[PDB]
Each structure stands twice: as structure tokens, then as C-alpha cells.
Write a protein that binds this DNA or RNA. Sequence first.
RNA 1: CCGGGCACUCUAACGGGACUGCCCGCGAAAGCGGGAGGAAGGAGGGGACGACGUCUGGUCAGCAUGGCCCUUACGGCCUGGGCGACACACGUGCUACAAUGCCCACUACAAAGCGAUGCCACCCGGCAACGGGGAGCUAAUCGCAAAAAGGUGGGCCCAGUUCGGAUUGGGGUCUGCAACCCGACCCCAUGAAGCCGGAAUCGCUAGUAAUCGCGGAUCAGCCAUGCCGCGGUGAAUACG
Lengths: 127, 155, 116, 83, 23, 97, 97, 60
Amino acid sequence: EQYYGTGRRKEAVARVFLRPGNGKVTVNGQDFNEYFQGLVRAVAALEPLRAVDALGHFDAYITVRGGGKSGQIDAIKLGIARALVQYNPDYRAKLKPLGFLTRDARVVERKKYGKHKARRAPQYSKR
Amino acid sequence: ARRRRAEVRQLQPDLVYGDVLVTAFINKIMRDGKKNLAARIFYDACKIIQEKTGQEPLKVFKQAVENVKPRMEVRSRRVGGANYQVPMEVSPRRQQSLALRWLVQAANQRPERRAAVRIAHELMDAAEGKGGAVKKKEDVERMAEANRAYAHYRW
Amino acid sequence: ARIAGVEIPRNKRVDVALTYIYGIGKARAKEALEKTGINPATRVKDLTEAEVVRLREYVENTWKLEGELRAEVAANIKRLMDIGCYRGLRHRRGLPVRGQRTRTNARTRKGPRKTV
Amino acid sequence: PRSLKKGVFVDDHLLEKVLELNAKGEKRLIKTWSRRSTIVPEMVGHTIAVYNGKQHVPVYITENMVGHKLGEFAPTRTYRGHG
Amino acid sequence: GKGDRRTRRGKIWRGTYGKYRPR
Amino acid sequence: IRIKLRGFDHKTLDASAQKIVEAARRSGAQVSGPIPLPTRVRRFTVIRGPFKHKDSREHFELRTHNRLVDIINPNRKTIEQLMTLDLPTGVEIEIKT
Amino acid sequence: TMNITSKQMEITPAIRQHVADRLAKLEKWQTHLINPHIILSKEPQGFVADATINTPNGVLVASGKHEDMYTAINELINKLERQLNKLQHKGEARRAA
Amino acid sequence: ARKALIEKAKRTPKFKVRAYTRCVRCGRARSVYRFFGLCRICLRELAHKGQLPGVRKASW
RNA sequence: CCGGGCACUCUAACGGGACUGCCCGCGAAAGCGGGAGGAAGGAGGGGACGACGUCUGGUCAGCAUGGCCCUUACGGCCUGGGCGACACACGUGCUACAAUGCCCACUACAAAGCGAUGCCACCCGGCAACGGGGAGCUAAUCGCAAAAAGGUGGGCCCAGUUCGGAUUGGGGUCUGCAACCCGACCCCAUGAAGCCGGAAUCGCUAGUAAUCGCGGAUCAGCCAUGCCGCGGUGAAUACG
Ligand SMILES: [Mg+2]
Ligand SMILES: [Mg+2]
Ligand SMILES: [Mg+2]
Ligand SMILES: [Mg+2]
Ligand SMILES: [Mg+2]
Ligand SMILES: [Mg+2]
Ligand SMILES: [Mg+2]
Ligand SMILES: [Mg+2]
Ligand SMILES: [Mg+2]
Ligand SMILES: [Mg+2]
Ligand SMILES: [Mg+2]
Ligand SMILES: [Mg+2]
Ligand SMILES: [Mg+2]
Ligand SMILES: [Mg+2]
Ligand SMILES: [Mg+2]
Ligand SMILES: [Mg+2]
Ligand SMILES: [Mg+2]
Ligand SMILES: [Mg+2]
Ligand SMILES: [Mg+2]
Ligand SMILES: [Mg+2]
Ligand SMILES: [Mg+2]
Ligand SMILES: [Mg+2]
Ligand SMILES: [Mg+2]
Ligand SMILES: [Mg+2]
Ligand SMILES: [Mg+2]
Ligand SMILES: [Mg+2]
Ligand SMILES: [Mg+2]
Ligand SMILES: [Mg+2]
Ligand SMILES: [Mg+2]
Ligand SMILES: [Mg+2]
Ligand SMILES: [Mg+2]
Ligand SMILES: [Mg+2]
Ligand SMILES: [Mg+2]
Ligand SMILES: [Mg+2]
Ligand SMILES: [Mg+2]
Ligand SMILES: [Mg+2]
Ligand SMILES: [Mg+2]
Ligand SMILES: [Mg+2]
Ligand SMILES: [Mg+2]
Ligand SMILES: [Mg+2]
Ligand SMILES: [Mg+2]
Ligand SMILES: [Mg+2]
Ligand SMILES: [Mg+2]
Ligand SMILES: [Mg+2]
Ligand SMILES: [Mg+2]
Ligand SMILES: [Mg+2]
Ligand SMILES: [Mg+2]
Ligand SMILES: [Mg+2]
Ligand SMILES: [Mg+2]
Ligand SMILES: [Zn+2]
């Protein structure tokens, strides 16, 4: 009756529970659209199931913490796509080719000494 | 760079129209990494051009792009003791970049007070073949033809 | 010279307009419009002469404005300059008074650069 | 400036001499290194010599210069201008 | 903006509080 | 029946978190297994050279690793036997209830 | 304008002015002298005159050395000229073919 | 003016403001770490020796 | 929050994992090009790490040390001043010149750290800085703490302005023995230059640049717009 996946992006972690139904979606105690209200980035989160037509087929209970809304959005995108592969193993094809099943390791590069930021160097006047 | 021909970043298709070209345009609008702002401005503009002229915004946008693409450009090359403006064909990748760049820049030289509006209207003129954006393209091309004589210096 | 000695910008909201008086800033703008019960959002062109003299009367009696204010600040400086304290000296030579560095900068006080 | 909850600061060793001179009737010159001491109403009419790091500067106190510090009247830098 | 004390943004940049940025 | 373990070396910390958890599991009954409390890191950043050369540093850190073990069903069989246990030097123990 | 540094030495306004009249020879080439910077210094062997100057066509960096501070300055000028003349004419070399 | 200063820094002062940390190792008044009682140079010198418990080169 | 449970998140110790290992192709080989599998692919991203040597590079003022020099003083204590000066000149930065913006009000989403004459909930006085009460926390417990950009609403209407926040006047707060020279902060008033910058010149190839805020060392307080870290949002382009 329940289906699960773990999404991570940057510093955001999302626990997502897929349970069949009509499509209601909840993030941390609120509707999807309540929590991501005013964010174009949002509907990208529901993209894995749109790939396998599970759009309206599932309700989703979802936790989210750490990072920021966009990273959280990307985290969700991952987990619910793990949940789908879990809900059906043959879902891998038509999910892996969209690279929805992979986690990007791109995170904040550390601040280095001698620099102003990670790579931004201090301005020098040779002469 | 020196070693290899770099890899063109594949963009993620935009949420509203599913378009890599739209995404690219958004980023060009985007100042200070405020993409939400950037997204609104375009989509707001997409709303406006529909009100003013009832068509498909996507169709307008894409038509405006094809109109600002320089097919030929000049690139300098100092041959001997003089810098010749050599006429060159523009790669399709570069045609795109210049088109989207000039579109936004010309947009933001316009007098009306809101960005979405400027972005709207410039896309309307460029679609019809008017506006500073197309003027840029026309000019770049004219420079190239003007120096057709140096087209054998092409590398 | 409507109010108060100065002819404040019409077409503008009364709170913003009032700040065009020497001695009245945004803080004092929100104050006088409460104490007289006038909508702070209303334009000066749309005031009632009832409200005008209402707004006028309070503002001119509660606080020192324009001329008399400038007179004091000057006297205050004229005083420091005359008693000959350090703060005074800085005013006399036109140099900065609040302990800023003068090796560079201090241009607001010094004025544009004099070549040598 | 200094908290009003706290005192009106005078170095006591400066102040003491003031009251001493007030009683007997003022005044001899008072050499002090106390730049940090407030001119106080009791000091008015005196002439206090304020050390600026180098010289002791004679300062005749008046009704106008009460609230201030003693240092304010014995400037510490010699500057006659540039060039 | 960030340089004006009499505003919210200015008090943030400076890391203080007051009428224009209360806690 | 709380035991809180703190050391600069985690090999000698986990060493001793193990042995306390073994000792009272033997003489029973229940040891709540060694929970690894998040580490508090104290960093020191220094200029490498003694004079100028600001843009060149070296990073040093001091890590205090924390462990927690709970002996649930104590039975002073354990309490007395615990009083003598072979604890390494780089570790500090705290017992409370 | 033009800056002069006298490292661990005292010099006079006169001497400073001398250097300015000496650097002035570079004005010959009718090109922009941007932030010329002269550093005067004393070694055990003699004086050292350093200079860094930028121009629209490159930088000039030269060091002059001699027992006589004025000669040290003059040799600095000589080295600077030779550089400036190369900067101003090297481009003409390959006008053909 | 050095040894007199590493000394005067030890004796308690006339007012608690005048107190300041010196490096207990070399007598340095600047860049003195409270946690060690050491300056940045000594901090580095002992750490490289391994004579600072738990302290190690930090890399991430 | 309670029962309960440790699944999940996490936390932090130990392991597994990628080796051009596997298929196509070119190769004498080494390798290169492409494919699949995979979270990751051809050093996975970043870090620590810097050869013989060079610059008679830097530091006798961190320390050590040869030698030369000082010995009621070139040693030592103190009070005060100065290191903060200001016709000028250059380097690094902060904030800006505004509408992709500014202001108000309401409402979300981090990480890494720090904290017992310390961090301070919550209460009350004050427009406020702050003050007086007062609980918790040897701190994955309690606290700093609110992250900001963002989101939602409302105002501003292109003006040197509701842009900008310098300068100065006045009134206060706090630290400290003491804020004259020479502190930070709050409030009222003042409201400068600046309409995007000559010659010239700096940075950055991807979670980078840009932009947004958070922490810490030093530290009574702070002249930090600095430095070392931390995450949020997140590009453009590389023919050659
Ligand atoms: Mg929405
Ligand atoms: Mg960052
Ligand atoms: Mg440098
Ligand atoms: Mg652009
Ligand atoms: Mg153009
Ligand atoms: Mg035309
Ligand atoms: Mg005003
Ligand atoms: Mg000064
Ligand atoms: Mg403002
Ligand atoms: Mg630096
Ligand atoms: Mg000079
Ligand atoms: Mg000197
Ligand atoms: Mg000199
Ligand atoms: Mg040299
Ligand atoms: Mg010659
Ligand atoms: Mg030559
Ligand atoms: Mg001495
Ligand atoms: Mg010594
Ligand atoms: Mg101190
Ligand atoms: Mg110290
Ligand atoms: Mg488990
Ligand atoms: Mg390869
Ligand atoms: Mg190696
Ligand atoms: Mg040397
Ligand atoms: Mg020495
Ligand atoms: Mg020696
Ligand atoms: Mg000998
Ligand atoms: Mg002294
Ligand atoms: Mg001083
Ligand atoms: Mg200094
Ligand atoms: Mg000059
Ligand atoms: Mg200048
Ligand atoms: Mg700065
Ligand atoms: Mg600058
Ligand atoms: Mg304008
Ligand atoms: Mg003005
Ligand atoms: Mg102007
Ligand atoms: Mg204004
Ligand atoms: Mg004042
Ligand atoms: Mg002071
Ligand atoms: Mg510019
Ligand atoms: Mg700008
Ligand atoms: Mg130029
Ligand atoms: Mg690179
Ligand atoms: Mg900004
Ligand atoms: Mg900060
Ligand atoms: Mg701290
Ligand atoms: Mg501090
Ligand atoms: Mg200052
Ligand atoms: Zn030391």
C-alpha cells in the first residue's frame, strides 16, 4: 500500500511516500502549491511520474528539510522517482534515460584562503 | 580553450512550454541569479503579447528569434599592417546566442517602464521585423557584405 | 508659501510632501498627519483648506522649522567656534568633526580636489 | 556620550583642588593632566592649565564651555596648513 | 539601500535593531 | 544510568564505548548501544609565515567526538565491576542518571 | 600623477624633483605614462633605482644600480627608454609580408 | 622593550581593561589564541611537532 | 506532546563501490573515440600535498643566533599626547547612481559554528539603542536564531526622486577607571556627491561567476565595509 524514496539535492533531503489515489500532494504539512507558491521551479518536481503517466494515479506524502526551496524541489524529483522504480522495477527504463533516477553531486565548492570566494581572486594592480 | 572544443551546455526545457530556447532566453533575462524574477518577466511578457496581439506567444518569440539571427558577421584579423574586417558565416549555436543577447539588450534600451513590457514589445517588433534588435542584425550583415572582398581571408 | 513658509509639492502624497520642509522628515510626517487626522496618502492638491490650516497650525507650533531652525544650528556652530573647542576648530577650518580620517577622503567636507 | 545613569565624571583630584580654591577664594593656576574631566559649574572663572602631551595650555573657563571636556580646549596637534 | 540606517535593509547589513527593524 | 564519552581521538573513543557497552551487557541486563553524538569541531587558521604573506594559510582543527551509552537494567553487579575498567588516556567519561 | 618612494632613506623635495625631470625624458615618445612609480633604495654596493610604468602598449620595469644615486637614476632611465622604444616600434617590424 | 613587557603583562593591572594576552611561549602580544595561550606562530610550531593534543592538519 | 518504535531522516565510526573492468571501433603497444551498466566514468568534484633550485626574495620587530653598539640609559615605571594629522598622490574594498528597483506589512526555505563574572528564552518599561525582572542550557536537550534574497499583498511613477545615505546639528544608550583628541549603537532633524565612469585595468570555465544572507577567530567595547569559513539562489560563453 505504501511506496518510498529518498531524494537529496545540495543540502536538501526529502522523504517521499507514494500512496495510490487521486493526486493530492503534501509537503511538510501543506499542499504542494501552498509550500511552493509562486515558484516556477515547482512543477518540475512532479516530472518523474509524468514520464510514466502516474500523474493523477498517486497521492504523495512528503517530508522536506535543509537547503532551500529549489534544492528541495530537486530532492523531491529524485525521491518520487526512486519510489516509482520501487513501485515497479521495470520503471527504470523510461526513467533512467531522463536521468531522473540519478543524484547530481554538484554542491557548494568550499571557500579557499587567498580568494574572496571559492574561485574569485582578489584584484591586484601589477603596475 | 587550447586542448579540445568545449561542450555546449544542454539546458533544461522550461516548465510552461517545454522549450530549451525559452530557458536560454530566461537566463539571458536573469540578473543576479534571480531566475524566479526572470521567469515571471518572460511569462508576464508572454501574457502581454497575447493581449495586444492574440497569437501564440511561443510562435511570436520563436519568430522574433529567427529574425534577429545574423547569418553573416565580420570578425577582425590583422593581416600585414592593417586590421581587415573579415566576413564570416555565423555558426547556428552563435546565431542563437547573439539573437537572444540582442533581444534582451535592445529590450532594455526601450522607454516603457516595466521589463515584462519591454521584453513583450521588443519580441513583437522583432517578430514583425522592426526594433533595435533587428537593426543590430541588419547592420552586422551589412558590414559583412560591405567587406565581401576580404572573404578569401576567411579561416 | 502655503505650508509652512515652503510651498510643498502638490500632486504628491501629503506625508511625502511635508518632508520638503526643513525640519520635517518622514518620522515627523507620519506624526502630524495622525495628530490632525488627515489621510497620509492623500495628495496636497486634494487637501481641504480646512485640513491645510489644520495641518499648517499644528506643524508650525510643534516644531522649529526652516529659518529659525537654520538660525539655531548656525548659532550652535558659531558657539562651538567661538568658545574654541576642538569641535569648533574643525568647523572653522572646514574639516570633518566626527573623528573621520582626513589622509584620504573627507571630500564632502573638503570639497573637490585642489591641484598642487 | 557617557551614560546619564552613571556620573558626571571629574577625576576627583582635579575637582578637589577646585573646591579647595573656591572656599578660600580663588585662584592660583591649576596644572592638570586630566583631559577627561568635564568642565563643571564650580570650575567657571578659573584658569586651568591643560597638558596636551607637550605643553600645559592655560584655559579660562566660562559659562559657555561648561558641558564640555577639558581636552577640547587644549588641541593636541600643531597644524598651520600645507605647502 | 544597505547603507541607510533609517531602513530595515540598513539595519540588517549593519546587524543592529531599532524602530526601523524591531525584534 | 547515563554514560557520556568525550575524546579527541575516535579510535580510542569507540574503543572505550565498546568496552563499557560490553561490560554491562555481560553482567546485564540492557545496554542502550553507543550512540555517536555529532562532533564539535574547533578550527584554527594561521598564516604560514611569521611576517606578511597574508594570502598563505594553514588549517588546523581540534575534534571533540562524543559518544553516549545507556545501561538500562543496571543491577549493581555492573555498577561495582564498572568502577574498574581499563580506559585509554585520550578519553573522558561522565556518569549521571 | 607620479609617485616616488624612498625606501629606508630620507630624500629632499629637490631630489624628488630631479627624478621627475629625469623621467621626463620618456615624454619624448609622446605616449601616456600611467602611474609611474620610482623606488629609491640603498644597498651596501650603492643605490638602487627601481621603476614600474604602464603605457597603452605595455609595462616598463627597470632597475638601475650605481654608487652615485644620480647615475643609478640615469641608468634606470636608460633601461626604461630602451624598453619604451621597443614597445613603441616592435609592432612595425613585421608590416611585410 | 620586550622582557619587561612579557613581565608587565603577567602582573595584575590597576584596571582590568589594561589586561591583554601575550603568547606564553614567545611573548608575542599579537594574534594570541585564548584556547592555547599561544600565538599563531607557536600554534603552528607545536602542532607540527604533535605536541598539541588532538590538533591535526585540517583538510576538506 | 504522550504511549511506543528506530523504520525513515539524521548523526558518526567501519566497510562496499570505478579498474578503461565490459562490448563496438582504431591501434605495434600505450592509449583514444563511442556504447551499455551505474549514484558516480575515464584523475567523479574539491582539499591536504610544492622537486633540484632561483629571486645575495622576505622576516635580527614572533622566536633563536654570530658580531657591533647602549649601561643613573639606546634599560625600567608612570601620566598625557601620538600611531587616527591632511594642499595632495596610488593600491584594496564598501555603498551606490535606481522600476529585473526602493519602501511598508504579513509569510516561508539553510549550513557551519559559538556559548557558566557565557549564550539568553519568556515578561515588563522605553519609538528605540537599551534597561530591570527571570526560566533553560557543564548544551544533537537550552540559547545566539530572525537567515536574506524569495513568496503574498499594499505604496512609490522616472523626478537627484519614497533613488543615494555622505555631511552636520540635537537628544540618548552601552562598554570601560576614562570615549576631548579617539568607540560602537539608537532616535529626531539635516539629506552632499553620484544619471553608470578617460587613458588604462581585474576576476571567473559550473553549482563557477554574479547576487543573498549566516557564523567564527581577535575581542571590555570596537572603528570588520577586513579576514577565514558556511549555506541560499544560480547564469553566460570557449570558433580557435
Ligand atoms: Mg504556483
Ligand atoms: Mg556560496
Ligand atoms: Mg599583492
Ligand atoms: Mg544581456
Ligand atoms: Mg544593440
Ligand atoms: Mg527594417
Ligand atoms: Mg525635510
Ligand atoms: Mg582623524
Ligand atoms: Mg533611502
Ligand atoms: Mg587579502
Ligand atoms: Mg611620491
Ligand atoms: Mg620613513
Ligand atoms: Mg624622503
Ligand atoms: Mg628589484
Ligand atoms: Mg639616451
Ligand atoms: Mg631591445
Ligand atoms: Mg624605550
Ligand atoms: Mg627579546
Ligand atoms: Mg585588552
Ligand atoms: Mg593579545
Ligand atoms: Mg538501523
Ligand atoms: Mg577518455
Ligand atoms: Mg602527490
Ligand atoms: Mg636583501
Ligand atoms: Mg632577534
Ligand atoms: Mg642580532
Ligand atoms: Mg670577537
Ligand atoms: Mg601612556
Ligand atoms: Mg593614544
Ligand atoms: Mg597605522
Ligand atoms: Mg603629489
Ligand atoms: Mg584618484
Ligand atoms: Mg572597505
Ligand atoms: Mg576603489
Ligand atoms: Mg533616472
Ligand atoms: Mg537633493
Ligand atoms: Mg549633480
Ligand atoms: Mg531621498
Ligand atoms: Mg551629535
Ligand atoms: Mg575615543
Ligand atoms: Mg561599469
Ligand atoms: Mg549596476
Ligand atoms: Mg581602454
Ligand atoms: Mg580553470
Ligand atoms: Mg543588491
Ligand atoms: Mg558576517
Ligand atoms: Mg564569537
Ligand atoms: Mg568582537
Ligand atoms: Mg571612525
Ligand atoms: Zn608565540
